[PDB]
């Protein structure tokens, strides 16, 4: 039966999104309770971005330099501070639509929904993964800065990403909601290489389990492997090494299908060595690595 990349319903995040302007920079902010989180680079001129001293630049700013707009309503800023690379604007009104929420740092290879916003206005929702090299293959246009990534955990919106910037390859870099960058990136105009963008092996394995659950079985072989010997082949193909803990999180899907993790590892080994021979798995011609084991469990019953 049918298998699709899916985002979390966004309604709870839509009612947290605002416009923030400082001089001639407009980007998005996240209004939770009476605090507006946005990227601190909002305070910079193009000249400042060459070697910003954010402490010095922010001290020179006052509350009234920050224009917040929640719809066509203008929010009164009664305080401006800095936590790492996120500006916090304190405001005179607590967000009526403030949901139950939490701030979480995600692991490389974990997935999350992006609510892509323009001028404080929700435009689109898509599912993506934190790449091994801590970049996001996002869809972001100018004014997409301050757009947030999240998971919904039972009732609880878990915010995990804020968009800050784009690297020369068109990949996206950003912070958790404590303002620490994912990866070795800095909010200033200097050369900044992402690492090698490896494939998230544990996610491919989940997806092959998805494929089995949905009646795609052609790539199943009779072979087996050790975790060491699988990782030898993985290393050669720019795949992340599989850890015992990866095997552990795959356990539920191993159980549901009856296919041991290392047997599924043996199937993947063979696809890597031989390709697909112009065949597809769940409609793809490439191995998909943006579904976690939990993603597949969630969707597949």
């Amino acid at each position: 039966s049918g298998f699709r990349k899916m985002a979390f319903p966004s309604g709870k995040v839509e009612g947290c999104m605002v416009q923030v302007t400082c001089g001639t920079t407009t980007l998005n902010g996240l209004w939770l309770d009476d605090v507006v989180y946005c990227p601190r680079h909002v305070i910079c001129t193009s000249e400042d971005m060459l070697n910003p001293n954010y402490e010095d630049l922010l001290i020179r700013k006052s509350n009234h330099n920050f224009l917040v707009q929640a719809g066509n309503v203008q929010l009164r800023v009664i305080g401006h501070s800095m936590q790492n690379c996120v500006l916090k604007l304190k405001v005179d009104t607590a967000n009526p639509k403030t949901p139950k929420y939490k701030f979480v740092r995600i692991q490389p290879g974990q997935t999350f929904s992006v609510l892509a916003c323009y001028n404080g206005s929700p435009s689109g929702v898509y599912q993506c993964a934190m790449r091994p090299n801590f970049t996001i293959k996002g869809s972001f246009l100018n004014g997409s800065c301050g757009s947030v990534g999240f998971n919904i955990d039972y009732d609880c919106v878990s915010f995990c990403y804020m968009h800050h910037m784009e690297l020369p390859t068109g990949v996206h870099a950003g912070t958790d909601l404590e303002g620490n960058f994912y990866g070795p990136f800095v909010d200033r105009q200097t050369a900044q290489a992402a690492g090698t963008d490896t494939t998230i092996t544990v996610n491919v394995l989940a997806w092959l389990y998805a494929a089995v659950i949905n009646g795609d079985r052609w790539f199943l072989n009779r072979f087996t492997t050790t975790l060491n010997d699988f990782n030898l082949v993985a290393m050669k193909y720019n795949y992340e090494p599989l850890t015992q803990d990866h095997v552990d999180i795959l356990g539920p899907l191993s159980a549901q299908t009856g296919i041991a993790v290392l047997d599924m590892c043996a199937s993947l080994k063979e696809l890597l060595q031989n390709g697909m021979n112009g065949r597809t798995i769940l409609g793809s011609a490439l191995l998909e690595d943006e579904f976690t084991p939990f993603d597949v469990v969630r969707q597949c019953s």
């Binding site: 920079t25 980007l27 990227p39 680079h41 971005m49 100018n142 004014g143 997409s144 800065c145 800050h164 910037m165 784009e166 690297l167 020369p168 870099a173 990136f185 909010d187 105009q189 900044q192």
Partner: peptide, 4 residues
């Protein structure tokens, strides 16, 4: 980099 490119911001915004």
């Amino acid at each position: 980099i490119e911001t915004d």
